RNA sequence: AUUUGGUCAAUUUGAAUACAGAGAUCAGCAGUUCCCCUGCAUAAGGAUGAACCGUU
């Protein structure tokens, strides 16, 4: 039962160079790890911690 | 009171032969245009489905 769960569109933009080689879904144990993963495409800035 | 409205053409001629003059009728199908339905393609544009975790 997940009434708490929800989704929000954070961004809806245009990128100069698309460094994402494919669609590499993942899970990480921590936030730092996630950030690092994101920055594998030289783009940590996508994640919005709230 | 009379009379014109009355010349067959065609051919053989240097009047004779001709004798009215030479496809019909019934029925398909396709095309042309517009419309409607149906299946497919092409573009575009939606809508939606599908277990479960992925990739340095």
From Swiss-Prot:
It is found in: Nucleus. Present with 432 molecules/cell in log phase SD medium. Participates in pre-mRNA splicing. Part of the U4/U5/U6 tri-snRNP complex, one of the building blocks of the spliceosome. Component of the U4/U6-U5 tri-snRNP complex composed of the U4, U6 and U5 snRNAs and at least PRP3, PRP4, PRP6, PRP8, PRP18, PRP31, PRP38, SNU13, SNU23, SNU66, SNU114, SPP381, SMB1, SMD1, SMD2, SMD3, SMX2, SMX3, LSM2, LSM3, LSM4, LSM5, LSM6, LSM7, LSM8, BRR2 and DIB1. This is U4/U6 small nuclear ribonucleoprotein PRP3. It comes from Saccharomyces cerevisiae (strain ATCC 204508 / S288c) (Baker's yeast). The gene is PRP3. The chain holds residues 418 to 467 of 469 of the full protein.
